[PDB]
A = this chain, B = another copy of it.
């Protein structure tokens, strides 16, 4: 079947199984896809969303090891625009109303976040070995 260009974006700080599963889900939305992944900039992520431990370079370098990722846009724009979709020939944006225009265009595909699998969740489990009293 025809190849379908999927776009997903995010911070991908301390990349964990949750990110990985969401990228796999985007990659598998259709039989034949190219998954493009956008990685948000340090300055915009910190200004608009919250704290980030790893630099853009570290987050991008780690993402390149993930088998679902076909292309990385690093840094990506903070806000997706129709001109951006046209520039990269993107057929669907995979995401989990600023997205209203994507749905109106037929270019929205839902993916899911997995709970309980994050990197900080692992550290919390480490800390649980030490009793309060």
Contacts of A117 in B (CB 8 A): 58
Neighbouring B residues of A66 by C-beta, 8 Å? 65-67
A20 at the interface (CB under 8 A from B): yes
Among B61, B67, B126, contact of A53 (Cβ-Cβ < 8 Å)? B126
Q: Which residues of B contact A67 (CB under 8 A)?
A: 65-67, 69
Q: How far is the CA of A21 from the CA of B58 in the complex (A)?
A: 13
A28 to chain B: closest CB distance in Å?
12
Q: Does A24 contact B (CB under 8 A)?
A: yes
Question: Which single member of B24, B119, B125 contacts A65 (CB below 8 Å)?
Answer: B24
- Beyond A20-B62, A53-B122, A53-B126, 9 extra complex contacts between A and B, CB < 8 Å: A17-B58, A17-B61, A20-B65, A24-B65, A65-B66, A65-B68, A66-B66, A119-B119, A119-B122
